Each structure stands twice: as C-alpha cells, then as structure tokens.
Amino acid sequence: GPHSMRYFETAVSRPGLEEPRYISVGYVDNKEFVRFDSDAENPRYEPRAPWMEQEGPEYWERETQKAKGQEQWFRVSLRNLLGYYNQSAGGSHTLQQMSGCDLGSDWRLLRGYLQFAYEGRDYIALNEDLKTWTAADMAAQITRRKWEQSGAAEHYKAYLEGECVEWLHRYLKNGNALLRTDSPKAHVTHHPRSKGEVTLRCWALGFYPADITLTWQLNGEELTMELVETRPAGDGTFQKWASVVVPLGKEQNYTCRVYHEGLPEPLTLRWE
C-alpha cells in the first residue's frame, strides 16, 4: 500500500494576545505522531504514537529547535501579511501551512506538497513540479516574487525529495503494525418516516482509514439519499451511514453497498 507524511502547522493571532500561538502536528498515513504547541508549559515536540518513544533525545532536541524557528517565521510572516492586506490592529488572523510527501506502494516519491493559507484561504502553494509557485491574490504576488528571487522552491524541493522521504521510510519501518487497516462492518436499520414510506439506513462501523463509500440501488441504479460525513468513533475507527426513503412493503428491492480498501471485495446487504 501507499504512504504519506504531513506536517500541518498553524499560527493564530488575536486582539489582546502579545504573541501568536503556534501549533505543529505531524502525520504518518494520516495518524498523528508528533505535536508541538507553543502554549504548553515547556513547549516541545512530543511523541503522539507509542512507536515514536523509540527516537532518542537528539531527535526531540533538534525538532523542537526547528519548531522554535517556525514560530518566529510564522510570526514575522503574520506581521508582513497585515501590511500586505492593509489590515489594521484589532483583529484575529491565521496563517496555516501543509507540507509533506506522498509515496506509492513502491515507497518512491509520488508527490511533494507545500502550501499555505491566510485567514483560511489559499495564499501561496508550491506546484507539483516543485519548481514554480501558484499565488492567486494580488497581495500574494509580493511573496511569490520574494521567493522566486530567493530560490525558495529549490530548498523546499530538497526537503520534500530528501528528508521527508528519508524519514518517512524510517518511520514506516519503525511503525509497522499503522500498517493494518480495519474493515467496515455493515448493517441496515428500519425507521418509520411518513405514511406510506419508511427509512432504510445503511450503517458502516469500526473501519480505518476514513475513506469509504456507501451507496443504495434499486434494480441496479444508484441514487441521489442522505449521507453523514465520516465521523470518528473516538477509538481510532470511523463511522458513516447513508439513508433512503422507501415505500412500505417494497424494502427487499433496495440494496446497500459498502466500498473500502480493507475489504476483499465490496459488501452487499439489505434490511432483514
């Protein structure tokens, strides 16, 4: 199977607060594994999966120092951005970064990622070529030029192709057994809805990872049905359901399908 690492970083400024709060959260295969929070008593990168306790004090020292650098970086940047957007003192602002790499089943780099958002909106992002930048806003051109003139892309490229892959490989070796998936377990419930009609609700439960698809069909055609957003059980696994309104006494015509990477093939069921 394919793999990935991300680091999701946030800085937030607020009216009263002297200094922005900075949080960095790292992910391997979308499970959180390291975290830094400037609001902590003693701000440091802490392990967030039992398999990271392996890394020795050098690791945590250097990653923590790396964090303190970002904290500065995000802070100066937030200040610059205020100026670029002619925003005055007296508001809240957020600067966000996602960085990382995707590997294929072969463990070779498939894609690097480097993007940033301001006020929850795309500000500037490194293109898939890892050479050029995309930057929508007129304010953002100021940055794009700065970074073009400074060769920023090449140094991020080095990181994404190098350290990111190198250390994900290492985390993946250290972490086997995030390797496994949990298949969904499906059932259907019956609920009255109106006169003449009822509600069939296909539940999927106990699955990891989150990505899953639920469908309903009536003699072979899919439907257009209510679906909830996939939600955490709170125990590492996920839940989803999808529902359709059905005529009374015609419920054995309707079939639910569940699709998930953990399955040997999709599951098929109906109400019983």
């Binding site: 680091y7 960095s24 790396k66 970086w73 100066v76 610059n80 951005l81 700065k146 400074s150 990111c164």
Partner: peptide, 9 residues
C-alpha cells in the same frame, strides 16, 4: 521530520 521554512512571506 518537519520542514524548516526559508524566506518569510
């Protein structure tokens, strides 16, 4: 391991 950003915005 986390990125260490270069030029500021």
């Amino acid at each position: 391991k986390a990125p260490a950003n270069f030029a500021t915005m």
